[PDB]
Amino acid sequence: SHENSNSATEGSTINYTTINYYKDSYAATAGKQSLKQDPDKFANPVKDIFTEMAAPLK
Amino acid sequence: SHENSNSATEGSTINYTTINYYKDSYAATAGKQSLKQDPDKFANPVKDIFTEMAAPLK
Amino acid sequence: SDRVAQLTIGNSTITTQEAANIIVGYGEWPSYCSDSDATAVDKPTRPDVSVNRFYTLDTKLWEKSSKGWYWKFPDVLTETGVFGQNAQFHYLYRSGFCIHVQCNASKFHQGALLVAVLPEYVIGTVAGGTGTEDTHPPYKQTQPGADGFELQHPYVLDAGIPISQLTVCPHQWINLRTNNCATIIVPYINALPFDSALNHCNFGLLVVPISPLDYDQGATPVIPITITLAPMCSEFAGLRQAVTQ
Amino acid sequence: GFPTELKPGTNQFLTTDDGVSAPILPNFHPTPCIHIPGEVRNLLELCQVETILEVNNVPTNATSLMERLRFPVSAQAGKGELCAVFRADPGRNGPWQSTLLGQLCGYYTQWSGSLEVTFMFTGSFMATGKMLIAYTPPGGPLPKDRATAMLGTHVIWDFGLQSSVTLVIPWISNTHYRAHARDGVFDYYTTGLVSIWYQTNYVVPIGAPNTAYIIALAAAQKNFTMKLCKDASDILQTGTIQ
Amino acid sequence: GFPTELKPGTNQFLTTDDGVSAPILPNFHPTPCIHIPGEVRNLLELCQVETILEVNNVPTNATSLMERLRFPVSAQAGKGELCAVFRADPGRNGPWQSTLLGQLCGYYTQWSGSLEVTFMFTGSFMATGKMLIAYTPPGGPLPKDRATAMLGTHVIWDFGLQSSVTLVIPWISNTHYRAHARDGVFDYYTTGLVSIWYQTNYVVPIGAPNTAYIIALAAAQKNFTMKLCKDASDILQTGTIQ
Amino acid sequence: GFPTELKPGTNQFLTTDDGVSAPILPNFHPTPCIHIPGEVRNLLELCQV
Amino acid sequence: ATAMLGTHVIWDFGLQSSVTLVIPWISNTHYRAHARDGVFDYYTTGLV
Amino acid sequence: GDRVADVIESSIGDSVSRALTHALPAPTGQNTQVSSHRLDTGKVPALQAAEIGASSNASDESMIETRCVLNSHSTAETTLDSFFSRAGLVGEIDLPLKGTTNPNGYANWDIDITGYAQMRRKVELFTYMRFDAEFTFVACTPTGEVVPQLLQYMFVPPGAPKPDSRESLAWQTATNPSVFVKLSDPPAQVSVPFMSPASAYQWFYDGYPTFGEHKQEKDLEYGACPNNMMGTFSVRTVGTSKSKYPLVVRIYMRMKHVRAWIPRPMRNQNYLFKANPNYAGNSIKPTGASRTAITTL
Amino acid sequence: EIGASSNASDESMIETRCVLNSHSTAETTLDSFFSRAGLVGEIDLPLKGTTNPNGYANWDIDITGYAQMRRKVELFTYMRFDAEFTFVACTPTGEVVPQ
Amino acid sequence: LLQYMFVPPGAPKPDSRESLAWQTATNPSVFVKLSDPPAQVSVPFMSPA
Ligand SMILES: Cc1cccc(-c2ccc(OCCCCCN3CCN(c4ccncc4)C3=O)cc2)c1
Ligand SMILES: Cc1cccc(-c2ccc(OCCCCCN3CCN(c4ccncc4)C3=O)cc2)c1
Ligand code: NA
Ligand code: NA
């Protein structure tokens, strides 16, 4: 459709697949999100990464 | 669609994108208008335009 | 080779021979505000070396009964050096931080401090004990300045949330048998590109002993904990007269 | 018939719903539209047009209302004396309410952009002078003296053939948009203060008025926009309009 | 009009129905989204982050709450004495409730995956020792002695420069997913038991504390997932929140 | 909106109607189906026993 | 707190017995004459 | 132009925020690979240094002998939209006949969803959130009965006149959006866009909304951020005469197109007030169940 | 005096940075501002009354009896448009009856 | 007007007509009137087996 781009997720690293009947995109359904994940951002935010086999304090 | 052209905006400098199910165009939605603007028509209706850098009264 | 380290920024250099690597919060380095994210139109001032350097602001004493403390950023610096001045003369401020918490002892002492950074650390009160009184923490408690402030109930971080889950935030531990310092780099965190360094504290620094300090009679009993921090990529805009609050 | 299932919202009347409704007059064709001058396409076109700012919003008796349209300047004692002050908040009660910008602003919840105020000196040709007009971004209290005001964004105006000068109130905010500011927590969206001081002095020779007036005209810059349409704070009717 | 026929479901309001509803503000455009650090895309990202496990969940008076965050070890009599025990069931009442994993777990009816608990020794540098940490799969009763515990999945931890060790609680189930376990027929979904024993002994020289503490951090492995979204067992409000 | 007209049958609940109904658990994925012996596809399979 | 505002080093004791404080050349003139109490204090290098 | 070297080589102005991690696709749980006995020196996966601040990197494969397992378990239900896009109660508004509260046939409700624990705890898991939402309005009498009554719901954004009565001129609603609907009709439902002046709403704001001295009497404003205050929800029975029936309006919110930043520890003490995280000091309870001893179940 | 507004911009009055403004101008179009249903007429049909006690009523189509709407349209001298009219009926208490 | 709520194992079961559990922030619920047609929904295969 040729609608307005007023969705809260316009320009997101994860694209969505939705349905809508109005000219304003935020009226659209939640749809399906993309399944990307970045655990390291929280679980391993270290500068100099340390291997599994090696001892963490060299 | 092949409808009548009885919309109040038929023949406007700004084209619209609308929806309708009836044979009379004025029944259609408001849709999206085109985003053109002519501020000078009101803010600067002078015959001999004067630059920004120069002094307005030469 | 991960234990030894040197941090040099501005005219200041820090060394440590018992480190535990470096944490870069949420996995990203501080950066200046892009032209697309910005909104204010005036050309910013970026003092560089005169404000992005290490400032050693406070020292607390770790005791067998210490509860823990917290500091608010950028509150801690608003009245120090050239950074403070810029924060006072300007309406808008933005920057990142390199936090270096120090605490050394001996191979005969023991204890573990949890050092973490919690964005938008909103303080709460005990609500009159019974929870019927809608009290509110006073300015001196929400923005304690450089002396920091001691946690009244560390278990719930004085905000009704479990400290046991504080590790979901950028953090490091100072386990005396292992390291004598924590280093955490933090990017600017806010929902706006710039903000007031006076009215809004972007995050809080928490230092809480989870494993009590201990040692035998005869070992040095005075174990200080010192806080050193450096702004990074500081930017200021919206200039006028200086204001303290 | 075809299997359908009604969802919530059914039968509701949303005043802003842009739907399709049956036409009452089939095959009716409207009177053609001739050319008419001055067609406006967007309210922003109007916001760039300067209208008079009532900086002198003090007189209230009917006979003196016209005095609100201009403030004075006159020979002083050269101590960098203060001439006038006003908040820059455009959608806030005060001077800005006299401007079309302020009024149109009332129909929107949020705004964003730089503003401009042009001051026109209406004294005699022989009168001269230099004024310092300053804009103090949020956080800065009303400047106690000219030296303090001078630390913010400002312009030093010199009277001459060019009767007017323009103070630009650049967009300096923490947020991309400001809601209408007012006393309370919403003062968070305040734009700041504008103060006018005597840089030199109003000088005039023998035979010319010792007092002249300045007229302020304000409008928005081309980066100005508004959003979140709302009803204006005023409703100009008491009882039923007959 | 077009022939339609309403089916059951008509007019109902399903809280989880992902439908389309009319927009209240036509042509409204949201404030652009700047870059903000730490964006999370999936709750599973959070489940891999270790949080403190309250193995020592016995003290209850306010002044001692912080003691729940760590348990002790101290010089023994070398009889392979027991140090501590706890169920591995993550979505069950007990130690796991202190962890973010346990809390997020409460919003899902079923889970599947391996778990991990990392133990950090906080004693003095001069303290040494070897502990045996075991995981007893379903069916195995609380090990009466170290010899019995040793028959299951386990790790023998040696204190040294590396302050911590990781016990992996591998996914060993009969079903692909486990629902939250609890006393009763639902104990069918129990994960098992974790017991900690002294392999050698906590040894320390003259001049160092005879008691030190261990802090346990737990999270999920990368094969962990959850399903069938539900409301958490707790509702943190008594009366109306004012 | 679009011109529609309700026909008889409207609102009725036919127990054998093979229709479409809203899903209560969006994005839910069922436990995978392992191999199980003895799958029957048609009752006629049983009638020959 | 005041000293900390200048050029400095934070030394940590360990296997490396020593640390080096660099007293960088920060002068108004290209050369300094020998400093001493009086007008020649103009050439002072500073304090450690 | 530039000429001195320190200027040419400086990094002052780099707007490209270097990131140490990137997101990878993960539609299913990770599989398990076959493994065998390893009797090596130097190699030590089991040992870690939690002090660093990172979680363990040790996996099943390196701690025990594992078989191969093809894990097709989906990660779809744990996405933000899956977790949050479920309508939940966020507001209740009473319109009684003979009463102490709203005995005038109308009512104003500040749009704040923090008065309900289930929803509040979920969103407070994150510091910043940006989303669109679907609101549903369920009306009926206090007994749950449906009556032939017409209502008007009007969204009053900050700065717009709040109706002061059932007959206020503001109900002309020439610009504000309003919904006229009967109790007999199905619940009213509409879509709402992300409306903050900020790039995201934030459930926590550690600061003050204005400059100045922050004396005792202004502490009610600590933590108040206008960017989160979207306005008022006004409702009235549509008539110049009082309604014949007492009404109740329940408000349900279903977020959609969600983005969240900065995860935080989850609330573990009962909520007391909407505006703050205050907790009952004399009833600080452990986060969970407790037992008699650490060596017994 | 010329009658034109100032042409001075931010760039020429202070030192500015570069800002990429993506703020939309969509909500200030005529249709955006006016295409919002507002009250323009109220008609009474009482039983025992002074006005229309006969079960019918005539209303001259004039929308100037209501301030909110009137002030908005009076911003312009000439206007051309199509319109969508909605009729909401009920008793004086807001009750719905089979009429 | 009635409210039907699906309470999966582990979720709090309402203990009264006024229970907090009816906030139904995560469980799926259906609000419907007796005057409306029968409520109808689709349910997936939910066993761990
Ligand atoms: C046509 C119509 C009629 C009646 C109501 C509405 C309506 C109501 C609410 C709308 O706003 C929804 C706002 C949802 C987020 C609310 N927030 C955002 C941040 N926040 C918050 C609360 C407490 N502390 C910090 C943040 C909130 O409570 C939009 C339209 C629309
Ligand atoms: C099938 C049906 C049933 C009942 C009513 C209608 C209906 C009612 C009004 C219609 O007219 C709408 C006219 C809108 C503009 C009215 N104007 C145009 C100019 N104007 C005005 C008022 C005062 N001074 C100057 C101009 C107005 O009040 C069309 C159809 C149609
Ligand atoms: Na129609
Ligand atoms: Na229609």
Ligand code: NA
């Ligand atoms: Na028909």
Ligand code: NA
């Ligand atoms: Na709808």
Ligand code: NA
């Ligand atoms: Na049919």
Ligand code: NA
């Ligand atoms: Na259905």
